[PDB]
Amino acid sequence: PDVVLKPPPLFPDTDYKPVPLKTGEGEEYMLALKQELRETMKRMPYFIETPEERQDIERYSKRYMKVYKEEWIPDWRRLPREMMP
Amino acid sequence: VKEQFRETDVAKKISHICFGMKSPEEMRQQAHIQVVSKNLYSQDNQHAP
Amino acid sequence: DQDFESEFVEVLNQQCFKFLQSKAETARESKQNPMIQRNSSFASSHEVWKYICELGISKVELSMEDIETILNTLIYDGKVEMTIIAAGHMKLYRAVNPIIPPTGLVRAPCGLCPVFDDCHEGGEISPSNCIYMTEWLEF
Amino acid sequence: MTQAEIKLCSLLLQEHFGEIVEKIGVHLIRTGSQPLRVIAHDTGTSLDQVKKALCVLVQHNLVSYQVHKRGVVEYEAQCSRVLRMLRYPRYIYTTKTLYSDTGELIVEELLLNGKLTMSAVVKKVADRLTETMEDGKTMDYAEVSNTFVRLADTHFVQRCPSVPAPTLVINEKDMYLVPKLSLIPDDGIYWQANLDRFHQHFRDQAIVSAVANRMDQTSSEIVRTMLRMSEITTSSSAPFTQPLSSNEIFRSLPVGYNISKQVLDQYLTLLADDPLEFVGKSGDSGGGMYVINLHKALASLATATLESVVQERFGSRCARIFRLVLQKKHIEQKQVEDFAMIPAKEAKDMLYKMLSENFMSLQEIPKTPDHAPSRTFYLYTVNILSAARMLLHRCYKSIANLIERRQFETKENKRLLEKSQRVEAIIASMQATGAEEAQLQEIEEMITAPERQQLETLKRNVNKLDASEIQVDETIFLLESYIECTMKRQ
Ligand code: SF4
């Protein structure tokens, strides 16, 4: 029956240390494959990077804003007929 | 230097009251001090916390 | 009186495991093409008794129960297996390997973390200001 | 389903897809089926963006929809299909280890676009491969389609339900036909990769690897052969493999392995007479047939996973008691120590530390209608199903924490990153014009030591986290196959 006045640390030092990982040429191959899948699907039309953009005053520099807006064909035939954009 | 606009005194009414139960995580998030000691009074010069 | 010497007990256990591993070494280097006898190249309790006699560690121990209990503590570890056969009941012991390697679950520091319930973003202890995460990243 | 999986898929759809679409996707997991207008109302998002999110989710065959009471369309998002985006690299690697870059670049675009026609796959594969070569830019369409047929007849890429009112009811048939191509217009036929086949292949690989490093290297060839003849006749739910005999087995063995008949039967009986109990023989005095047990092997795999977790976290001495009480079911507290030669103090410590973390259960045996905690009997027992199900809930929050830690470090050194990358293009275009080593010392000393030392550590940390992610999500796959087999859809 003893009393503690100083509270325990928020990070109590663990019992043992974590385990190192397994590495093979396939492992870094899959790592680079995931790193390129994420970057490419970030640069896909399916990825909506256009929530909405607000512009208060109009400028003359309208030449450096030629963004190509090509949506994928939604294929409404094999799609719910109720939903029509 | 210029002063920033600030509301003078926020006067509002109470619309409605909602009932809910908290989680231990939110309880710790709101809590300030963690009691670990059971001794109420210290056995020193005078009654002191 | 039941003696207990944990150091002596576990060093005896390590020596017995090494001896059975060496028997498995000899069996595997032998490699008689018909391998029924290879898997049957076990070491019964009566031969680990001879090994106990050749150890020369401490003679105040009755062989049968001590060795069979140590092999029991070994099968509890998951390192060797026993099989009994009624001919007279003879117990043979074989050396088995682990089934699958250590999982990738625990290799992340989140598996070793003792504070798992309090872990949450937006407030106190979280993956952002975690000491274990930083200590894992620096190494 | 629970808060952990929802929190994980939220980030998985915020880093893969956009914020607007991931909002509606997560909102579809809290409520099963809801009308379009009610969704657009309670979510707070406008109608056009909601329709965009919905068509994005449908294009990746992530959400389904059905016709209800009057003519209404109820949408439903399944989380189990969403949580399988962490194994795309493993799927592509498994396609590339058997086949070559053909199958890899055929299937890697089938999972990034979901429903896609083969005329588009051949198109894009041919274009990318012609762009990859330098002098000879000739890629045969026939060899690209040959690997496609190899996927089609091995049941790797199947046909999604085609087109046969407020909407059309999509119907599926058993017509997995391959319409004959016309290489230099076939519409209404979309192909998609089949994931359960990949799961079956991974299960066979795990089984053969376990039986390899367990007893022998040769018997794994025999079981992998026994698992190769049943790829066509056996399915996933079926717990017992179709019966096969040894005479048919000796017919199909590898070419570089010459093993005779009676020694093969020797190996088969050694596999039958075995405590692991993977293969079981039902025969006669004359002959018989062998049957591979999948469920009783998955149970052993999950058990081994549990003991490995408790041995890495708690210790080997603790896992020893775990296995001791798993063997002797319902053992009592004072009789566990006469078996396990372990000091009573720290033994009780280990037992209580295990039970306080939900690793063991205690059952009550009272002799009175009153509970009487004093006058009662406690027994210690182990439950495999609940322990596997509770470790599965931990893995997901672990993966979520790893993803949050990986995403956290990028936004403090972000402007530094796109500023050091902006300097890269200043000299990348300059070197084309003419190499100036003075403009090189400009970039040699323009970046300071901590300005270049941050990327060095950030890349390593990102690599470490993304490599731990796969080692963790393989464990959830090994753990979700034992839970679903015992689950019986009544
Ligand atoms: S973020 Fe760190 S402290 Fe929090 S659960 Fe993960 S490993 Fe543990």
Q: Whose CA is nearest to atom 1 of ligand 1?
A: C127
Burial of D233 (0-12, 13-18, 19+ CB in 10 A): exposed
State the Cα–Cα distance between residues D338 and D316, nearest whole angstrom. 19
- Give the closest residue to D403 by CA, choosing from D4, D6, D15, D5: D15
Terminal alpha carbon distance of chain D: 20
A5 touches chain B (CB under 8 A): yes
What is the count of residue pairs from B and C with beta carbons less than 8 Å apart?
11
- Whole-Å CA distances, D383 to A37, D300, D464: 40, 13, 34
The CA radius of gyration of chain C, in Å to the nearest whole number, is 23
Contacts of B36 in chain A (CB under 8 A): 4-5, 7-8
* Segments of D238-343 assigned E as strands: 279-283, 288-292
Q: For residue D396, give the 3-state DSSP assignment.
A: helix
CB D150 within 8 A of CB D191: no
> What is the enclosing helix (H) or strand (E) of D379?
strand D376-381
**Which residues is C83 bridged to in the sheet?**
C92
Rounded Cα–Cα distance for residues D9 and D76 (Å): 15
Atom of ligand 1 nearest to the CA of C113: 8
Structure tokens at A58: 């109009």
Taking one residue from C and the other from D, the number of pairs with CB-CB distance under 8 angstroms is 121
Structure tokens, D122: 């051949």
CB under 8 A, 24+ apart: contacts of D27-35: D28/D57, D28/D63, D28/D75, D28/D76, D28/D77, D29/D77, D29/D79, D30/D6, D32/D76, D33/D66, D33/D68, D33/D74, D33/D75, D33/D76, D34/D74, D34/D75, D35/D72, D35/D73, D35/D74
Q: Which chains pack against C, by 3+ Cβ pairs within 8 A? A: A, B, D
Nearest CB partner across the interface for A33, out of D36, D56, D89? D89
Distance CA D25, CA D6 (A): 10
> In this complex, which of C72, C76, C108 lies closest to D472 when CB atoms are compared?
C108
Cβ distance of C118 and B29 shorter than 8 Å: no
Beta bridge partners of D240: D293
- For the stretch D90-95, contacts whose Cβ atoms lie closer than 8 Å and that sit 24 or more positions apart, written own/partner, are D90/A30, D90/D470, D90/D474, D91/D193, D91/D195, D91/D198, D92/A30, D92/A33, D93/A26, D93/A29, D93/A30, D93/A33, D94/D198, D94/D201, D94/D202, D95/D156
> If you count them, how many residues does chain B have?
49
> Helices D295-313 and D449-486, interaxial angle, to 10°?
140
Q: For residue D61, is it left (φ>0), alpha (ψ between -120 and 50) or beta?
A: left
Ligand 1 centre from D176 Cα, in Å?
48
The one-letter code for the residue type at D293 is N
Measuring from each residue's beta carbon to the nearest atom of ligand 1, which residues come in under 6 Å?
Answer: C 109-110, 113, 115-116, 119, 125, 127, 130, 132-133; D 401
Residue among D76, D16, D23 nearest D50 (CA): D23
Largest CA distance in chain D: 95
For residue A14, give the nearest of C101, C112, C125 by CB distance. Answer: C112
d(CA C12, CA C2): 17
Nearest one of C121, A19, C100, A74 to D53, comparing CA atoms = A74
- Closest-CA residue, ligand 1 atom 3, reads C130
Contact partners, residue C98, CB within 8 Å, separation at least 6: C78, D213, D304
Torsion sign across C-alpha atoms D207, D211, D213, D218: negative
CB contact under 8 A, A7 and B39: no
Q: Rounded to an integer, what distance in angstroms lies between the CA atom of residue C135 and that of residue D417?
A: 24
In this structure, what DSSP letter does residue D405 have? Answer: H
A43/D contact by beta carbon, under 8 A: no
Residue among D441, D440, D444 at smallest CA distance from D431: D440
In terms of DSSP bridges, do strands D63-68 and D157-159 run parallel, antiparallel, or are they unpaired? unpaired
B36 contacts chain A (CB < 8 A): yes
Residues D3-83, CATH architecture? Orthogonal Bundle (1.10)
Residue with tokens 């003075």: D438
Closest by CA to D362, choosing from D346, D383, D348, D347, is D383
Helices (H), chain A: 25-42
D379 with D365: CB under 8 angstroms? Answer: yes
Is the backbone of residue D339 left (phi > 0), alpha (psi -120 to 50) or beta? alpha
Q: Which chain A residues are Cβ-neighbours of C112 within 8 angstroms?
A: 14-18
Name the structure determination technique.
Answer: cryo-EM
D42 Cβ contact list (under 8 Å, min separation 6): D27
Q: What are phi and psi of D169, to 5 degrees?
A: -85, 110
Cα(D312)–Cα(A33) distance, integer angstroms: 30
Q: Please report, as a single letter, which amino acid is at residue C10.
A: E
The position carrying tokens 């990825």 is A47
Ligand 1 atom nearest to C133, measured from its CA: 2
Resolution of this model in Å is 2.9
